[PDB]
Ligand binder design. Structure first.
Ligand code: HEM
Ligand code: HEM
Ligand code: V5G
Ligand code: V5G
Ligand code: V5G
Ligand code: H4B
Ligand code: H4B
Ligand code: GD
Ligand code: ZN
Lengths: 400, 402
């Protein structure tokens, strides 16, 4: 059992949860923890484990209902090769997959998750309808609510449901003749696929992409998001009057749509989930990464900072002011947002809660510590143990 | 078999083949990663010695030469007759530079080939240890134009006590524990402060009292030596546009000189081998001054900057910390004391990574310690995947001598 120390306070816990099912990339000879992407008999083992977790959560372990559900899943796997989750099992499973995600700093919220059951979905058009209801519910006119919509599970001899977009709201990136990008460089690939499937492109820096939705065994189909459904926030700064003139904006709803949800050995390749933004995601990563919008030096130069010498810390000063502008603009627009200080303090509470409830908490230090002001937050001084529990959200290959 | 290592800013990919030579095991397993943890005879010796000698003769392109063959035979005969062996001076120099080159948590390693190595393996007494340490400090400080150096005292030997420096660094500020539980001075040094008082030091009561050295010669109790004030160059902290900042009375010292690590070369162990470079400014401004369990000045600076400290969403913490770091950089430059900011230092570490891929096929690096503690993703190392492993020669943690 790993000993885990908090170096700010000196407190020690032991992770007993890590003893519980998959293997990561590290060995005794070398740590690869910094890498971004590290039978029916096997299905029943994972199914049995999940059903056991569920009957524990509803305080009916070893009960008659518990034994009958295990026998029921065995019988279904024997007759069909797969089995079907009850609605309440799906909800519990989706919440566990969030609770178990090591790279998510927002997991104090894991028990408050609205689950939309879309396992009856038949077509891409129905898929579009479910997604529009999700966006509307989750946005809630700016009072954002975490949600997930679960489309039908994978089954053998039948293609998956897939959302080709990486998120439900994404800005286009148009490759220029010189290699550079107008718009978001992260989305060049999906922008071109949208164009190759017949979308008429724009030419702005913040063009909302259409959805490419794949129903089983069909080519992907294009759907345009109604503009009144996509809430955006113009970026302005509270004292830098010129900041608004830069025309920067971001969208309200972070809705990831390319991960696979795994529950009890069942796989849901299309299960988009959404929360609300932590401000550093927008102000530091999306706007300041050199391979994203890369506007850090544009801002610093307008702040009249000395950008010809690194030791003026112009990069740090401009980055903080862009993060201030994100926080101010979302609060002004009444769109839910959390700064990195408040988010990391809540994650420290989550760690304390999970120590009492499960004996530990899988956490990826490099992803929990925010990308600015790392050691100013309490998670920096907190040792963490990284391991994979199920139910889980997993990366999956692009559908193309 | 070999890990793929990608840079996500540029998309470039390398393979770390150097990791196969990792000799020691780390704390991770396939089932859980522990990379964020701070703290993870004859035939054994001879194979470590042979590997090091082989490394040495490869570094000078004289592999398989008569000199190479003769040295391996000489070491093999020395270990059989004495149970150990002695490094040649050139081997010690190479070994010390290799240990620095191999240190996964050091962002400064672009400098690894430029290291002054003082051979103190003839030292006999604590008084003479003090002479070598003063000469080291004078050479390394160089009136502010800092030069990297290491002094290596005699190796560990069965039946004799170790040379040890009890202090964690050659220059440290005292920490005095108060009644309320708080600390006057540096909370990191409360233990060594009390140890100095228990060996007769008359303590001050300031926030920046330079501690004496506790020096231990073999089989002797530690002996207390006061550093002459002219040896210890210090930098008063001021801020280029916040004029009240200088009135705070903050200062820091020029020379970071770590004295509590063990140097291991070819199976030999040097428990006293203090080394020094120059500061990266976030060590002083973010960690030493703003850590809540250190001097913890962040909120006072924010209040003095007239920032609204009632809500976190003003990012008052971030703004105050950036200005403290500006002050450190401005003050050292004003004092003409070498310093590097975290942008220039991480840019040079990226160059080091490129050099080491060509020279050796990889480079052990600990991502959490290479990425600076403010503005992480504004530096190139943030977007660089890294492989962490243990090579030898190496600097190792070791237990406190008390
Ligand atoms: C409710 C507010 C939430 C906040 C503030 C939040 C915050 C974050 C942040 C900052 C990251 C780092 C992602 C990156 O930098 O790429 C992250 C990752 C992640 N989040 Fe959360 N999140 C929230 C809700 C959710 C929800 C509702 C789910 C799923 C039900 C979820 C699942 C995940 C997963 C799986 C990752 C892993 C990222 C990856 O592997 O690329 N989060 N979260
Ligand atoms: C010359 C300029 C140098 C710079 C800018 C530099 C920078 C740094 C920094 C920022 C750290 C992390 C410190 C922390 O946050 O606790 C570090 C660690 C380290 N440095 Fe360097 N350094 C330099 C020279 C040296 C030299 C000359 C040596 C030895 C010959 C050395 C050996 C080490 C080792 C062994 C560590 C790891 C410490 C640990 O594991 O706790 N450094 N360095
Ligand atoms: N506050 C907040 C809350 C929820 C979501 C977010 C957005 C940040 C985030 C969270 C979770 C997952 C995620 O993205 C997964 C991803 C991204 C790119 C990929 C590219 C290729 C591939 N095969 N998989 C990918 C998976 C982003 N923020
Ligand atoms: N000595 C000096 C030394 C080196 C380089 C320079 C050029 C400074 C510079 C470079 C690039 C762009 C730039 O644009 C400044 C700018 C733009 C708009 C502003 C709006 C409002 C405001 N208050 N300031 C603004 C500054 C400057 N100079
Ligand atoms: N730019 C720069 C250059 C050289 C040195 C520094 C200081 C930062 C640093 C570097 C290397 C080692 C180091 O400290 C090692 C240490 C610290 C505390 C310990 C407590 C107990 C123990 N058993 N070992 C310890 C070892 C600090 N900066
Ligand atoms: C190489 C590095 O591990 C990688 O780029 C990580 C670092 N930490 C991160 N942390 C968060 N929250 N999000 C990220 O995308 C990354 N990227
Ligand atoms: C728990 C965490 O890994 C630990 O506090 C580390 C993180 N990264 C660090 N990075 C540096 N440069 N120095 C440190 O002392 C630490 N501490
Ligand atoms: Gd002023
Ligand atoms: Zn690891």
């Amino acid at each position: 059992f790993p000993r885990v120390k908090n170096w700010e306070v000196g407190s020690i816990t032991y992770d007993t949860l890590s003893a519980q099912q998959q293997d990561g990339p590290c060995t005794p000879r070398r740590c690869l923890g910094s890498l971004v992407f590290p039978a029916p008999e096997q299905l029943l083992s994972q199914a049995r484990d999940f059903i056991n977790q569920y009957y524990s959560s509803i305080k009916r372990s070893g009960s008659q209902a518990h034994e009958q559900r295990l026998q029921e899943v065995e019988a279904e796997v024997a007759a069909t090769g797969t089995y079907q989750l009850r609605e309440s099992e799906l909800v519990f499973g989706a919440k566990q997959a969030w609770r178990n995600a090591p790279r998510c700093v927002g997991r104090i919220q894991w028990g408050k998750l609205q689950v939309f059951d879309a396992r009856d979905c038949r077509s891409a058009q129905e898929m579009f309808t479910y997604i529009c209801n999700h966006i509307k519910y989750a946005t809630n006119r700016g009072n954002l609510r975490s949600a997930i919509t679960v489309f039908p599970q994978r089954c053998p001899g039948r293609g998956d449901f897939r959302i080709w977009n990486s998120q439900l709201v994404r800005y286009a990136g148009y490759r220029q003749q010189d290699g550079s990008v107008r718009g978001d460089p992260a989305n060049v690939e999906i922008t071109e696929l949208c164009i190759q499937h017949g979308w008429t492109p724009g030419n702005g820096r913040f063009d909302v992409l259409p959805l490419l939705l794949q129903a089983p065994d069909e080519p992907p189909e294009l759907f345009l998001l109604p503009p009144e459904l996509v809430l955006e926030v113009p970026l302005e700064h509270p004292t830098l009057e010129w900041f608004a003139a830069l025309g920067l904006r971001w969208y309200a709803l972070p809705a990831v749509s390319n991960m696979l949800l795994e529950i009890g050995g069942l796989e849901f390749p299309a299960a988009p989930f959404s929360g609300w933004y932590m401000s550093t995601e927008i102000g530091t990563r999306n706007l300041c990464d050199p391979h994203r919008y890369n506007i850090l030096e544009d801002v610093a130069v307008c702040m009249d900072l000395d950008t010809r010498t690194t030791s003026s810390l112009w990069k740090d000063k401009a980055a903080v002011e862009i993060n201030v502008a994100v926080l101010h603009s979302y609060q002004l627009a009444k769109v839910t947002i959390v700064d990195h200080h408040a988010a990391t303090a809540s994650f420290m509470k989550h760690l304390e809660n999970e120590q009492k409830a499960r004996g530990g908490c899988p956490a990826d230090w490099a992803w929990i510590v925010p990308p600015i002001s790392g050691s100013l937050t309490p998670v920096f001084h907190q040792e963490m143990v990284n391991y994979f529990l199920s139910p889980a959200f997993r990366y999956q290959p692009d559908p193309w």
